[PDB]
């Protein structure tokens, strides 16, 4: 697609267009979207320092290189996945408290363990919280509360895949399948 933003000034068009790139997600392919986000958000581009060599010049800032993702991330991804996976309500007994993706434990704190795999990396996120808070999820928005700061990002589930917005780059997350791979 072609994304076009109009503004009264050029900063407006730029800032708007940038917002349209933030609100756009695309998964299942590699996309020049992360690239474009950076261009509009580049000091060089705001300053209109344009010439036909702009691309090959600032390439270092436009085409960075990945950073493994922090434990800051896996906790977020887990919460997200876990919450995109309800629990199976059986026609047998529809309101069964056993359908909670809660992690409820008797006297101790909520325990949930997930074997997630993003890109070509895999972690065993263990979610613990004697504090029900932290994350929630509505529609395609993961609402997180890193003690004090309530932030919200994209988290979209399509099939057996969870596409999470992280640092202006869509990351595909899925559950590890012990059987599939052992094979």
């Amino acid at each position: 697609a072609k994304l076009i933003a109009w503004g009264e000034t050029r900063e407006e068009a730029r800032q708007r267009l940038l917002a349209m790139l933030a609100e756009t997600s695309v998964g299942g392919l590699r996309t020049n979207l992360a690239f474009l986000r950076r261009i509009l958000g580049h000091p060089a581009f705001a300053a209109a320092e344009l010439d036909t060599g702009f691309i090959a010049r600032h390439q270092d800032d436009l085409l960075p290189a990945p950073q493994a993702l922090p434990e800051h991330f896996w906790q977020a991804a887990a919460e997200a996945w876990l919450q995109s996976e309800p629990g199976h309500r059986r026609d047998d007994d529809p309101h069964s408290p056993w359908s909670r993706n809660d992690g409820w434990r008797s006297a101790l704190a909520r325990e949930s363990d997930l074997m997630l795999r993003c890109r070509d990396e895999r972690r065993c996120v263990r979610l613990r919280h004697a504090s029900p808070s932290q994350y929630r999820l509505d529609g395609d928005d993961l609402v997180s509360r890193v003690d004090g700061v309530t932030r919200r990002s994209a988290a979209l589930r399509r099939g057996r895949q969870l596409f999470l917005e992280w640092e202006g780059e869509l990351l595909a997350i899925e559950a590890v399948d012990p059987i599939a791979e052992a094979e």
Partner: protein, 437 residues
Amino acid sequence: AILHTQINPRSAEFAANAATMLEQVNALRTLLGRIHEGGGSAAQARHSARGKLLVRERINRLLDPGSPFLELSALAAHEVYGEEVAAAGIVAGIGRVEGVECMIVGNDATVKGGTYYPLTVKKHLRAQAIALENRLPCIYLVDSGGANLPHFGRIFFNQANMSARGIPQIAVVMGSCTAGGAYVPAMSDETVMVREQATIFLCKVSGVADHYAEDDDHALAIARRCVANLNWRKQGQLQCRAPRAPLYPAEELYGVIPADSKQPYDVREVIARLVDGSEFDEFKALFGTTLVCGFAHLHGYPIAILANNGILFAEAAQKGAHFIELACQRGIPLLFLQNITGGIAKHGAKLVTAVACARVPKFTVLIGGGMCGRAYDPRFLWMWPNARHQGHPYYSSARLWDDGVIDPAQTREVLALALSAALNAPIEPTAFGVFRM
């Protein structure tokens, strides 16, 4: 219908009550916390070292993502033997596995090498007792170092009869099957075996394995595919309503219970914080006021409650027998909120008979200090910490006289999970003995 609370949360007599209670709930959370380590970070590291998941790591991986888990008797063996035998070296509990509520029983290899102490056996059996009565498929995570190197077998008998009754038995061997143990998987409809790791000492050579796995993770993954093909349908029939929360907060229960045993209180304040919408329809409120009786719903499940509110007298016994007669007629589960403070027997008989013969699922929670616990075979029996050295909840709980000490603020949740587990099985019609009129 709806109950009005006479309890002042922001009072001082209250905070006093919540004081000792929270105090105890915390003693519990700590002990359990300890008990959670099995044989200390020592053995646990050694175990993880051999590349194996810990019993509780297995249990959490086996379960459905986020699933609740109702651990049974964690205080098992506590201060009963010489040294420690955390949870008797076996972790039991009900949890969802491929949409099915299953009885999970695993050996904590890190507790005397997962060797059955008398209470270990008693607990393993107790789990099956529950699995049978509630028709809960079984999943045994085998990993043991003996039946005591320096009562059992009954165990296999159970596997056979449940299998015969259509309650699927599944074994997952991720360790040693020393002594008896070797039969546990032998006696299961389906066994998942870990290869070149799980020492099978007394797949196609033991002839006791139907699925082979590289590691503990693969194994549990397979165990899940097993439950995935049980073609399971629950048999309990009930007029379930959509769940509705109680009008007052769970925690307020801590303040309700007088800090002093003597100091009388209205148990109705306990009911009000457990049942749906706090609606309790009391039966014969002015007769046998020592025994509160009424109908209600909990997580949409209709229940008939009977809570002790003093000493059981004649009129109470009658009141109670009549009420249980009603519940059985209608096929409604029974909730016993027991706190036993303290010619006569002529009527107590009626209650006994009603309670003994009633065939709907029964649940009991001791919230205080005839009738009595394990005597009437309720599906489950839980104790609040405030309940009563040789009378400490830990005493009994540690010897399987009950299924565990639970957090008062969670009773509604526990009773809910339980009621639902129970519903896997049908609800038999009742036949009473000859009531001594």
